[PDB]
Amino acid sequence: VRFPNITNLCPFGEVFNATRFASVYAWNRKRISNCVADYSVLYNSASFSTFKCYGVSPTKLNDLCFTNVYADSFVIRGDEVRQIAPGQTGKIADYNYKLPDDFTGCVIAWNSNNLDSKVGGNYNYLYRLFRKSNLKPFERDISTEIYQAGSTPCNGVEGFNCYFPLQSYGFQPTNGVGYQPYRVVVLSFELLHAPATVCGPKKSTNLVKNKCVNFNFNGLTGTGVLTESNKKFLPFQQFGRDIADTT
Amino acid sequence: SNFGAISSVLNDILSRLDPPEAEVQIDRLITGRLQSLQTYVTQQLIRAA
Amino acid sequence: SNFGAISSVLNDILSRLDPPEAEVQIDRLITGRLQSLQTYVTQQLIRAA
Amino acid sequence: DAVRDPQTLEILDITPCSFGGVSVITPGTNTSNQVAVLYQDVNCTEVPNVFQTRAGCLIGAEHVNNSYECDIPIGAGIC
Amino acid sequence: VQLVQSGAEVKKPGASVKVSCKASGYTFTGYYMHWVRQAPGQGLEWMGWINPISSGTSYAQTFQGRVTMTSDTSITTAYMELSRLRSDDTAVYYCARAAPFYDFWSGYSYFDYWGQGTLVTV
Amino acid sequence: VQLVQSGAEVKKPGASVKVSCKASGYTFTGYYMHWVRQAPGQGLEWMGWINPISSGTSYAQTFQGRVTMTSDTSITTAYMELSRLRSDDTAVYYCARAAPFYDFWSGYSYFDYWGQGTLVTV
Amino acid sequence: EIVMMQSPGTLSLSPGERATLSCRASQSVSSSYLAWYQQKPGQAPRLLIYGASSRATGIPDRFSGSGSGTDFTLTISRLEPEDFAVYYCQQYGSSAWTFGQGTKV
Amino acid sequence: EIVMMQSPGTLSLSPGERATLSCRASQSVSSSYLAWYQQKPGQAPRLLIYGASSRATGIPDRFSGSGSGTDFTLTISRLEPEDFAVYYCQQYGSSAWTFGQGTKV
Amino acid sequence: CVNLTTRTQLPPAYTNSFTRGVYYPDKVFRSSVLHSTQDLFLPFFSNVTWFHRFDNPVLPFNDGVYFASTEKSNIIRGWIFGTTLDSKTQSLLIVNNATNVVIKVCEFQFCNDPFLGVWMESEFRVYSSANNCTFEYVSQPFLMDLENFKNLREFVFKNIDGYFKIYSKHTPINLVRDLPQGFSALEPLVDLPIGINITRFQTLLAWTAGAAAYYVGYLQPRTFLLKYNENGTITDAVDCALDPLSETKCTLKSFTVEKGIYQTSNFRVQPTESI
Ligand SMILES: *[C@@H]1O[C@H](CO[C@@H]2O[C@@H](C)[C@@H](O)[C@@H](O)[C@@H]2O)[C@@H](O[C@@H]2O[C@H](CO)[C@@H](O[C@@H]3O[C@H](CO)[C@@H](O)[C@H](O)[C@@H]3O)[C@H](O)[C@H]2NC(C)=O)[C@H](O)[C@H]1NC(C)=O
Ligand SMILES: *[C@@H]1O[C@H](CO)[C@@H](O[C@@H]2O[C@H](CO)[C@@H](O)[C@H](O)[C@H]2NC(C)=O)[C@H](O)[C@H]1NC(C)=O
Ligand SMILES: *[C@@H]1O[C@H](CO)[C@@H](O[C@@H]2O[C@H](CO)[C@@H](O)[C@H](O)[C@H]2NC(C)=O)[C@H](O)[C@H]1NC(C)=O
Ligand SMILES: *[C@@H]1O[C@H](CO)[C@@H](O)[C@H](O)[C@H]1NC(C)=O
Ligand SMILES: *[C@@H]1O[C@H](CO)[C@@H](O)[C@H](O)[C@H]1NC(C)=O
Ligand SMILES: *[C@@H]1O[C@H](CO)[C@@H](O)[C@H](O)[C@H]1NC(C)=O
Ligand SMILES: *[C@@H]1O[C@H](CO)[C@@H](O)[C@H](O)[C@H]1NC(C)=O
Ligand SMILES: *[C@@H]1O[C@H](CO)[C@@H](O)[C@H](O)[C@H]1NC(C)=O
Ligand SMILES: *[C@@H]1O[C@H](CO)[C@@H](O)[C@H](O)[C@H]1NC(C)=O
Ligand SMILES: *[C@@H]1O[C@H](CO)[C@@H](O)[C@H](O)[C@H]1NC(C)=O
Ligand SMILES: *[C@@H]1O[C@H](CO)[C@@H](O)[C@H](O)[C@H]1NC(C)=O
């Protein structure tokens, strides 16, 4: 088993215990790279109500390497948590935060009623209610242009068939669970044929040559015999392929 | 070829997914690879003739 | 033939469904049409012989 | 292959837009990089030394009245 | 659902008056706040509205250029500010709740909740 | 969330005192019960904790071997039993609620609810 | 603009009896945009009927409405002392809310 | 073990004014483990600030906290009669909860 | 900022891209093979816009761009990328000054005639205001020499899936007036993880004019057959959409075509109206 000899941990906690979460219409994105990602901490936690992985299993995350991890975060209403998934429709899935159908990542959510609700109502959390068309996966739209519902141009003015596109969640401590705020973190795992920069907490072993071994090179796995090569890899090339286009 | 699978590489499917999901992706590769192999053999039987 | 698809007509599948659903229906037509075409070619190779 | 128009009850016939295979006629690259192209079972009025033959529209080859032994077959007696 | 208005005000002609309306029991930004005036012995007159989510407004032509409507969602309160007052403005001012124009059913066409009126004398 | 403690006690040196703390308004077993002592004119001192789900404990070294903490989930009540009392133990004893050590956010690092203190004189 | 006219200006009847109030309009009004309000002396108006005929929440079944076009009515099947108040018709159209002059019961 | 030190032991100011209290530590403290409590005479302490800067539920926006390392503060933007109480800093580390000596306002 | 007005106004020049602009499409070593890839490439024999003077307006940035410079005295300094370039949106600035290379993705308010001046470096008049920094890099300091062409530098700029990808190649050149004929491949230089909307870009040059010229082409979705030699270097390529012979070469997966007739594609009349 061979992984880059890095020891710094990934700033996941910095995403999860942030004082302020974004509105879903204007969700935040943090790029995570060049670090060790321990996902057992997040998964084995008793604090999350939702922890759903798509594309990967939650118990194999620590054996994987990714080129990049994105951590998207926002607050939504409890009933809308089901919309943060592949293949969903609804006001959040369509106008605020869209996940691709081939999404690889984990959706993590927890009830944050004790942080985000106010007695008179917390009106700082917004969602897009109207949009001319659905969002593309991972698209943001933070405009406040008046939505034209009819055939008559609005010219920036609200009125009959002219709507302000955003609306607030009136988050109150007395709301039922489906109306309580949830903090959502979506971890998107990018996999392209490039150096991996985010790897789980795997220990490396000594390199063994001229013997049949089970190997794992920065996420590349297989069985074979490792020998010294006479191939001239260019400084940027990480692996090679045969005529058959196999490693 | 993926044949509809998330990956053409069997080891990658197995490194990411657990059996309840991995089997679905593997079935797609088996169907395609079995079909490709059957095509090869049929052509060799005709060519052999 | 539908081959399990909602329609034998590719344009009708695409006029009603979005890609996340259309692809499933299209895969059924591709599998069936590809199989039908392979059957035709195999018979022509044997017949040609 | 036919449809009745929904506003005026006219019957229209529907045919596909012209299509066909495209074949490239070439001496090997050891001799020349000049090529001729055959639009198979296509009219020379549909495609855009233009020779219309049974095999299709042959463009880039000069048609001559001198017969020779067959070299690169086009089809329908034409090489 | 409650709408609670400020107490009575007495102003000189040419002055300006501000009448608050505190909302509770509902999502403040989900509704429009309208104001309706009732001069003594008269019927009801619509003045205009404020949409708290965007602070969007519309005014009746009668008060257009005279009244400014604002709101503050942090305290779920609507304000009417009527300037250049005249004796003809002596009236009871009510705040009223109505649905936004996007309501599928015409909830914007009527006022389902009213605050207690605030008497303003000029 | 309420924490309700027993009334004041007066003991002779060498005696033992038991102070109850009844919890309500939350899942009892989801939190640790901590005890904090405050001698007159002094600051607050942490004594230890009891985890009701397992009756697991930890004590401050100062009271280790002197205090026993128990609980009874059927009546959602925590107990402190402080033995071998001395005059230096005259203090107000508070029960306090904190999250268990598995809380993702450090809810175990602080006390969010306190009962009324119980004065114990020795 | 549109004139909203109610009739009679004053209705006079006894408790226990039936009352009908009418609202006429210069121009045709969608039934969905017609509403009725009750204003007791010293109190804010409260909604009775909306959409021409639908009762507002908390309104007794004694109240009903109907109408279309230019002609709408409010009917009280049986009156109680509380019903001897001023009733208003209100309508939405264009971009404005128009009230009638009110009828006293 | 770690010494928790607050300063000044006594603060003196008038209602309507601003106050700042400090807590110093012998050793570095994660901000996530620092908390402040208010104790009015005759009452149990109640949480104000946790995680160095987060307000506890029910705490007025007048209270805020900040700090890192060995240096933490509690600030009251404007004082009311209720704020003239004893404030404590508390920290978690190791396997124990340590309080400062308290400062009186 | 300074507006330079002493400039002759001539129309744009155009040149032939020949077979330039090919880059390594991936990070995998392969050798003694012909590999077919679909990516954004500068089409062979494409129409390249050619600039000299102090010529450097804002140009479009589309799917990606190809940039090349011919110099004898290091006049080229760098590039500005963005959507509006006036602090309203995020923009990318890459500059090579006398002491180092700096890359910054701060919100900049750019000059409408940005430039550097120089033999020693002195003036720097690229932007005024700059805040809202999201990314920055500064290269280890070095001293740059500020005094026919000798140096050819080629760059490819792509903006895909959050990365601004820079590929580059340096070779000698020896002409007075043109872009060379021949083939070389551009190796990746850096992958910058910057999620910037780039639709426009501008070139920075370093009163008098120096001796330099630059060329701008545009990348298109094309299929290329790339020839890798024994050491995994791309030594040749076929643009499969250039002409019918190239199409045949791609179809047969070879750079050599034998005498014969090959079916390489399918002709189809496209619809012109929607009824
Ligand atoms: C928000 O969360 C971060 C990170 O939290 C960490 O990762 C999560 C996924 C969970 O596993 C957490 O339990 C885990 O702490 C906080 O920053 C980090 O806090 C920890 C714990 O105190 C620090 O560890 C200590 O480091 C010191 C050296 O300075 C050692 O002497 C200690 O023995 C111990 O190992 C860790 O270094 C620190 N990391 C960083 C980058 O600061 C963050 O403070 C927190 N903020 C709030 C308000 O809670
Ligand atoms: C360079 O010239 C441009 C115009 O091409 C100047 O930009 C204008 O500045 C005036 C103020 O003097 C504004 O009112 C115009 O709206 C601006 N026009 C544009 C297109 O932005 C620019 O200020 C000049 N720069 C310098 C240093 O002189
Ligand atoms: C080349 O660019 C670099 C990067 O901006 C310049 O280095 C900075 O110079 C400023 C101004 O004196 C300093 O405050 C920064 O601390 C420097 N940054 C670094 C990393 O050292 C450099 O001065 C520029 N060179 C020239 C000739 O203009
Ligand atoms: C509408 O369709 C009917 C079909 O019966 C046809 O007779 C009529 O002429 C059409 N009108 C127009 C304007 O096309
Ligand atoms: C093909 O080209 C080679 C030179 O590369 C030459 O030696 C050979 O004779 C040529 N053969 C034919 C048939 O032209
Ligand atoms: C091509 O079109 C012409 C009419 O312009 C017609 O006379 C000729 O026969 C057609 N040829 C073929 C092959 O269709
Ligand atoms: C062949 O000869 C005829 C005359 O008999 C002439 O009309 C025709 O154009 C010639 N064709 C070619 C290809 O030269
Ligand atoms: C490039 O396009 C322009 C505009 O049509 C044209 O004038 C010029 O000759 C073309 N140059 C080349 C090399 O194709
Ligand atoms: C940075 O962007 C925010 C908007 O997200 C804006 O409010 C802020 O003023 C910008 N910073 C500066 C220095 O302009
Ligand atoms: C870049 O900005 C333009 C507006 O000038 C917009 O139309 C386009 O969609 C934006 N591209 C992206 C990726 O946001
Ligand atoms: C490969 O590299 C070697 C140097 O190790 C060189 O001698 C040889 O000519 C190169 N081969 C090719 C095809 O460039």
Cα gap G43→A208, rounded to integer Å: 91
Q: Show the tokens assigned to I96.
A: 């090579």
Q: Show the tokens assigned to I262.
A: 């090959």
Measured in residues, chain C has a length of: 49
Residue nearest (by alpha carbon) to ligand 1 atom 34? H30
Q: Following DSSP, what letter does each residue of C1-49 receive, concatenated? A: --TTSS-S-HHHHHHH--HHHHHHHHHHHHHHHHHHHHHHHHHHHHHH-
- Closest of A193, A234, D31 to residue I229, by C-alpha: A234
The answer to whether residues I240 and I255 touch, using CB atoms and an 8 Å cutoff, is no
The answer to whether residues F79 and F35 touch, using CB atoms and an 8 Å cutoff, is no
Burial class, E64, CB count within 10 angstroms (exposed 0-12 / middle 13-18 / buried 19+): exposed
Tell me the chain A residues in contact with residue F102 when contact means C-beta distances shorter than 8 Å.
45-47
Cα gap A19→H55, rounded to integer Å: 11
Q: How many CB atoms lie within 10 A of CB A226?
A: 14
Residue nearest (by alpha carbon) to ligand 11 atom 14? I231
What Å distances lie between residue H47 and A115, C10, F91, H40, H104, CA to CA? 15, 66, 21, 12, 16
| Whether D48 contacts chain I with CB within 8 A | no
Backbone angles phi, psi at I50, to 5 degrees: -120, 120
What Å distances lie between residue E19 and C30, E25, E30, E95, CA to CA? 69, 20, 21, 9
The answer to whether residues I174 and I149 touch, using CB atoms and an 8 Å cutoff, is yes
Q: Is I8 helix (H, G, I), strand (E, B) or coil?
A: coil
Strands I22-23 and I185-192: parallel
Q: Show the tokens assigned to G28.
A: 């045709």
Nearest ligand 8 atom to the CA of I16 is 13
Angle, alpha carbons B27-B31-B32 (nearest 5°): 120
| Whether H100 contacts chain F with CB within 8 A | yes
Cis before residue I221, ω within 30 degrees of 0? no
Cα gap I22→I238, rounded to integer Å: 10
Ligand 1 mean position, distance from CA A22 (Å): 23
| Whether A16 contacts chain F with CB within 8 A | yes
Q: Following DSSP, what letter does each residue of G6-66 receive, concatenated? A: EE-SB----TTS-EEEEEEESS---GGGEEEEEE-TTS--EEEEETTTEEPTT--TTEEEE
CA A181 to chain centre: 19
The answer to whether residues I194 and I105 touch, using CB atoms and an 8 Å cutoff, is yes
Cα gap A141→E73, rounded to integer Å: 23
Beta bridge partners of G3: none
- Closest of A71, A74, A58 to residue A31, by C-alpha: A71
Q: Following DSSP, what letter does each residue of E14-83 receive, concatenated? A: T--EEEEEEEESS-GGGSEEEEEEE-TTS--EEEEEEETTTTEEEE-GGGTTTEEEEEEGGGTEEEEEE-
Breaks following residues of chain D (C-to-N distance > 2.5 Å): 48
Residues 6+ apart with CB under 8 A from H37: F44, F111, H45, H46, H47, H48, H87, H88, H90
* Model resolution, angstroms: 2.6
Q: Show the tokens assigned to E49.
A: 């509205």
Beta bridge partners of I26: none
Ligand 9 mean position, distance from CA I88 (Å): 10
Q: Following DSSP, what letter does each residue of I251-269 receive, concatenated? A: HTTSS---SEEEEEEEEEP
The answer to whether residues I7 and A219 touch, using CB atoms and an 8 Å cutoff, is no
One-letter amino acid of F99: A
Task: Write the secondary structure of chain F as one string of H (helix), E (strand) and C (coil).
Answer: CEEEECCCEECCCCCCEEEEEEEECCCHHHCEEEEEEECCCCCCEEEEEEECCCCEEEECHHHCCCEEEEEEHHHCEEEEEECCCCHHHCEEEEEEEECCCCCCCCHHHCCCEECCCEEEEC
- Closest of D40, D34, D44 to residue D55, by C-alpha: D40
The answer to whether residues A130 and A146 touch, using CB atoms and an 8 Å cutoff, is no
Tell me the chain H residues in contact with residue F44 when contact means C-beta distances shorter than 8 Å.
37, 45, 88, 90, 99, 102
- Closest of G1, G14, G31 to residue G105, by C-alpha: G14
Nearest-Å Rg of the Cα atoms of chain A is 23
**What is the crossing angle of helices C19-48 and B19-48, to 10°?**
20
| F interface test, pick of H46, H87, H97 with most F CB neighbours within 10 Å | H97
Distance between E87 CA and the closest CA of chain G, angstroms: 21
Q: Following DSSP, what letter does each residue of I69-126 receive, concatenated? A: EEESS--EEEEEEESS-BSSS--EEEEE-SS-EEEE-SEEEEEEEEEE-------EEE
The answer to whether residues F95 and F3 touch, using CB atoms and an 8 Å cutoff, is yes
- Closest of G94, G84, G55, G71 to residue G4, by C-alpha: G71
Neighbour subunits, F (≥3 Cβ pairs < 8 A): A, H
Cα gap I71→I215, rounded to integer Å: 12
Domain ranges within chain G, ordered by starting residue: 4-104
The fold of the H4-104 domain, in CATH, is Immunoglobulin-like (2.60.40)
- Closest of G73, G85, G74 to residue G46, by C-alpha: G85
- Closest of I20, I68, I14 to residue I43, by C-alpha: I20
DSSP-derived letter for residue A152 is S
**In chain F, what are the domains?**
2-120 (2.60.40.10)
Maximum separation of any 2 CA atoms in chain F, in Å: 44
Q: How many CB atoms lie within 10 A of CB B8?
A: 15
The answer to whether residues G42 and G32 touch, using CB atoms and an 8 Å cutoff, is no
Residue nearest (by alpha carbon) to ligand 3 atom 8? I138
Among B6, B15, B21, the residue with its CB nearest the CB of A63 is: B15
The answer to whether residues H52 and H32 touch, using CB atoms and an 8 Å cutoff, is yes
Angle, alpha carbons H57-H58-H59 (nearest 5°): 95
DSSP-derived letter for residue D46 is T
Q: Do E58 and A129 touch (CB under 8 A)?
A: no
The answer to whether residues I210 and I121 touch, using CB atoms and an 8 Å cutoff, is no
- Closest of A7, I189, A170 to residue E26, by C-alpha: A170
One-letter amino acid of A211: K
Per-residue buried b or exposed e for A87-101, using 16+ beta carbons within 10 Å of the residue's own CB? ebeebbbbbbbbbee
Cα gap I51→I72, rounded to integer Å: 16
DSSP-derived letter for residue A185 is E
Cα gap H75→I230, rounded to integer Å: 71
Cα gap A184→I168, rounded to integer Å: 41
Ligand that comes closest to the CA of residue D20: 6
Nearest chain D residue (CA) to I249: D29
Q: Following DSSP, what letter does each residue of A192-229 receive, concatenated? A: -SS---EE-SPPP-----SSEEEEEETTEEEEEE----
Cα gap I48→I44, rounded to integer Å: 11
Q: Do H47 and F106 touch (CB under 8 A)?
A: no
The answer to whether residues I222 and I23 touch, using CB atoms and an 8 Å cutoff, is no
Q: Show the tokens assigned to A192.
A: 């392209």
One-letter amino acid of I150: K
Backbone angles phi, psi at A94, to 5 degrees: -95, -35
What Å distances lie between residue G45 and E1, E77, F118, G59, CA to CA? 15, 20, 56, 13
Cα gap I84→I86, rounded to integer Å: 6
Among G32, G35, G44, the residue with its CB nearest the CB of E117 is: G44
One-letter amino acid of G24: R
Indicate if ligand 9 lies below 6 Å from the C-beta of I38: no
Strands E9-10 and E118-121: parallel
Domain ranges within chain A, ordered by starting residue: 7-120+173-201, 121-172
Q: Show the tokens assigned to I115.
A: 């430039």
What Å distances lie between residue E119 and E14, F42, G98, CA to CA? 17, 58, 21
The answer to whether residues I81 and I115 touch, using CB atoms and an 8 Å cutoff, is no
Q: Which helix (H) or strand (E) holds B18?
A: none
- Closest of E45, E64, E48 to residue E56, by C-alpha: E48
Indicate if ligand 9 lies below 6 Å from the C-beta of I132: yes
| B interface test, pick of A57, A61, A191, A220 with most B CB neighbours within 10 Å | A57
The answer to whether residues E107 and E98 touch, using CB atoms and an 8 Å cutoff, is yes
The answer to whether residues F92 and F102 touch, using CB atoms and an 8 Å cutoff, is no
Indicate if ligand 1 lies below 6 Å from the C-beta of A44: no
Beta bridge partners of E82: E17, E67
- Closest of I158, I163, I157 to residue I191, by C-alpha: I163
One-letter amino acid of I7: R
Nearest-Å Rg of the Cα atoms of chain H is 13
Q: Which residue has the tokens 């990314």?
A: I135
Q: Show the tokens assigned to E13.
A: 């002609």
Strands F9-10 and F118-121: parallel
One-letter amino acid of D18: S
DSSP-derived letter for residue D77 is T
Q: Which residue has the tokens 């920075």?
A: I204
Nearest ligand 11 atom to the CA of I230 is 13
Burial class, A207, CB count within 10 angstroms (exposed 0-12 / middle 13-18 / buried 19+): exposed
Q: Following DSSP, what letter does each residue of I123-165 receive, concatenated? A: -EEEEEEEE----EEEPPP-PPP-----EEEEEEEEEETTEEE
- Closest of A182, A196, A210 to residue A47, by C-alpha: A182
One-letter amino acid of I233: T
Q: Which residue has the tokens 């009669």?
A: H81
Indicate if ligand 1 lies below 6 Å from the C-beta of A8: no
Nearest chain E residue (CA) to A163: E102
Cβ contacts of D41-45, under 8 Å, gap ≥ 24: D42/D18, D42/I267, D43/D18
The number of C-alpha atoms within 13 Å of G57 and in the hemisphere containing its C-beta is: 4
H and B touch with 3+ CB pairs <8 Å, answer no
Ligand 6 mean position, distance from CA D48 (Å): 14
